[PDB]
Amino acid sequence: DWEIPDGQITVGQRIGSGSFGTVYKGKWHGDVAVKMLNVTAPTPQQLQAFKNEVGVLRKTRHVNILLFMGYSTKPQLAIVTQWCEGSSLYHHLHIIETKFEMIKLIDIARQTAQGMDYLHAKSIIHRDLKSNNIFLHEDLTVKIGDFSGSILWMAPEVIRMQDKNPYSFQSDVYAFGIVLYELMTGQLPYSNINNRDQIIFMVGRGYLSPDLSKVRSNCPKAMKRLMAECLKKKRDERPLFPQILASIELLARSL
Ligand SMILES: CC(C)(C)c1nc(-c2cccc(NS(=O)(=O)c3c(F)cccc3F)c2F)c(-c2ccnc(N)n2)s1
Ligand SMILES: [Cl-]
């Protein structure tokens, strides 16, 4: 049903690529983002794999999740989504250095906690959550998307990854903790470790978790506790997003 005829899609300039596909700004009844997959003439085992991915994205309707809009097969395999007018959270924290007040910081965390709560409720695991995947639409509304190398958000257990299935709900919770670290400190974790291979090594064996003493003076005390609980070493000792969301939903009212 969601099959959009291509000729309507005016493909524009290239935005870039990440963990999935190559992204372009486009037009389809207004501004849209167009994610090319670079698959020419799909084999039935690729068309079904494409429809399996579409089937997962189709299952998301939430104001904090990036709005899936359609998909094309001719001339190329592509996914059309809403266009976010703004900049990523990573961009605001480590590129622009935007002066967010604490009210705004906790707000961004709350919207992300709801989107993650929605995703987990629909049994969807992000697997690559990070501040670059938190798009601040109109510098107000969080839009989560972009479902190699980006280890600062990887949990310890994702370093095994050869026995069973290491990506879990708890692994998404850990990545959310790192986003909280960025929000409350203004920095990426492990600022003084100038070599990735040792970060991978340390976090993997577990002798390394971010320094919760870089947090800004006005960081709430419950936020400190929540960060520590999300960044706990063992999978099973991390809180689910229903508890995370509820904890933040109390902090915003106190603030
Ligand atoms: C810079 C980087 C990281 C390469 C980007 N990828 C997308 C992008 C574009 C389209 C889809 C998805 N994510 S997705 O493919 O996994 C997805 C859907 F295709 C549909 C619904 C939800 C969803 F997460 C994206 F991350 C970006 C993007 C998305 C929306 N608006 C803007 N301005 N940029 S940016
Ligand atoms: Cl539908």
mmCIF file of N, CA and C and ligand atoms in Angstrom, residues 17-18 23 33 35 57 66 68 79 81-84 135 144-147, ligand 1:
data_model
loop_
_atom_site.group_PDB
_atom_site.id
_atom_site.type_symbol
_atom_site.label_atom_id
_atom_site.label_comp_id
_atom_site.label_asym_id
_atom_site.label_seq_id
_atom_site.Cartn_x
_atom_site.Cartn_y
_atom_site.Cartn_z
ATOM 1 N N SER A 17 25.428 9.484 4.845
ATOM 2 C CA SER A 17 25.106 8.090 5.108
ATOM 3 C C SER A 17 25.613 7.707 6.491
ATOM 4 N N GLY A 18 24.992 6.681 7.067
ATOM 5 C CA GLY A 18 25.400 6.212 8.377
ATOM 6 C C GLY A 18 25.386 4.705 8.525
ATOM 7 N N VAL A 23 21.273 8.963 2.675
ATOM 8 C CA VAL A 23 20.143 9.853 2.918
ATOM 9 C C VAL A 23 20.220 11.053 1.985
ATOM 10 N N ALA A 33 12.703 13.369 3.592
ATOM 11 C CA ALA A 33 14.012 12.739 3.541
ATOM 12 C C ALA A 33 13.893 11.430 2.773
ATOM 13 N N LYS A 35 15.870 7.932 1.713
ATOM 14 C CA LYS A 35 16.943 7.030 2.117
ATOM 15 C C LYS A 35 17.132 5.998 1.009
ATOM 16 N N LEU A 57 9.349 -0.403 10.185
ATOM 17 C CA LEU A 57 9.168 1.045 10.235
ATOM 18 C C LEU A 57 7.693 1.422 10.191
ATOM 19 N N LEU A 66 10.769 9.183 14.172
ATOM 20 C CA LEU A 66 10.804 9.734 12.823
ATOM 21 C C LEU A 66 9.683 9.142 11.975
ATOM 22 N N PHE A 68 7.846 7.608 9.289
ATOM 23 C CA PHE A 68 7.863 6.875 8.032
ATOM 24 C C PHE A 68 6.688 7.309 7.164
ATOM 25 N N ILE A 79 13.277 4.614 1.006
ATOM 26 C CA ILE A 79 12.315 4.863 2.071
ATOM 27 C C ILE A 79 12.157 6.368 2.229
ATOM 28 N N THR A 81 10.684 9.508 4.394
ATOM 29 C CA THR A 81 10.318 9.879 5.752
ATOM 30 C C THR A 81 10.080 11.381 5.815
ATOM 31 N N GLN A 82 9.565 11.836 6.955
ATOM 32 C CA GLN A 82 9.411 13.268 7.168
ATOM 33 C C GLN A 82 10.778 13.939 7.226
ATOM 34 N N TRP A 83 10.804 15.226 6.897
ATOM 35 C CA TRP A 83 12.034 16.004 6.895
ATOM 36 C C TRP A 83 12.106 16.827 8.174
ATOM 37 N N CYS A 84 13.169 16.630 8.949
ATOM 38 C CA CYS A 84 13.386 17.392 10.172
ATOM 39 C C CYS A 84 14.168 18.658 9.842
ATOM 40 N N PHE A 135 17.256 13.848 16.474
ATOM 41 C CA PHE A 135 17.069 15.056 15.684
ATOM 42 C C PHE A 135 16.112 15.995 16.405
ATOM 43 N N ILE A 144 13.617 10.497 16.733
ATOM 44 C CA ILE A 144 14.604 9.423 16.776
ATOM 45 C C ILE A 144 14.586 8.672 15.452
ATOM 46 N N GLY A 145 15.770 8.394 14.911
ATOM 47 C CA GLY A 145 15.876 7.624 13.687
ATOM 48 C C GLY A 145 17.195 6.894 13.530
ATOM 49 N N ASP A 146 17.556 6.597 12.282
ATOM 50 C CA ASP A 146 18.778 5.871 11.937
ATOM 51 C C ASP A 146 18.890 4.565 12.727
ATOM 52 N N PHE A 147 17.931 3.678 12.483
ATOM 53 C CA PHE A 147 17.917 2.377 13.140
ATOM 54 C C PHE A 147 19.046 1.496 12.618
HETATM 55 C C1 LIG B 1 23.103 12.301 9.089
HETATM 56 C C2 LIG B 1 22.492 10.901 9.108
HETATM 57 C C3 LIG B 1 22.762 10.248 10.462
HETATM 58 C C4 LIG B 1 23.115 10.052 8.003
HETATM 59 C C5 LIG B 1 20.982 10.993 8.891
HETATM 60 N N1 LIG B 1 20.137 9.902 8.582
HETATM 61 C C6 LIG B 1 18.671 10.422 8.437
HETATM 62 C C7 LIG B 1 17.506 9.488 8.119
HETATM 63 C C8 LIG B 1 16.698 9.613 7.000
HETATM 64 C C9 LIG B 1 15.668 8.704 6.801
HETATM 65 C C10 LIG B 1 15.451 7.672 7.707
HETATM 66 C C11 LIG B 1 16.273 7.556 8.816
HETATM 67 N N2 LIG B 1 16.106 6.512 9.804
HETATM 68 S S1 LIG B 1 15.313 5.041 9.477
HETATM 69 O O1 LIG B 1 15.609 4.538 8.137
HETATM 70 O O2 LIG B 1 15.838 3.959 10.310
HETATM 71 C C12 LIG B 1 13.534 5.275 9.730
HETATM 72 C C13 LIG B 1 12.675 5.234 8.648
HETATM 73 F F1 LIG B 1 13.167 5.010 7.395
HETATM 74 C C14 LIG B 1 11.317 5.412 8.841
HETATM 75 C C15 LIG B 1 10.822 5.639 10.114
HETATM 76 C C16 LIG B 1 11.684 5.685 11.197
HETATM 77 C C17 LIG B 1 13.043 5.504 11.005
HETATM 78 F F2 LIG B 1 13.895 5.549 12.070
HETATM 79 C C18 LIG B 1 17.291 8.462 9.012
HETATM 80 F F3 LIG B 1 18.099 8.349 10.104
HETATM 81 C C19 LIG B 1 18.667 11.847 8.685
HETATM 82 C C20 LIG B 1 17.476 12.808 8.666
HETATM 83 C C21 LIG B 1 16.210 12.364 8.862
HETATM 84 C C22 LIG B 1 15.173 13.236 8.843
HETATM 85 N N3 LIG B 1 15.397 14.524 8.641
HETATM 86 C C23 LIG B 1 16.660 14.969 8.452
HETATM 87 N N4 LIG B 1 16.907 16.382 8.230
HETATM 88 N N5 LIG B 1 17.692 14.097 8.468
HETATM 89 S S2 LIG B 1 20.101 12.257 8.971
#
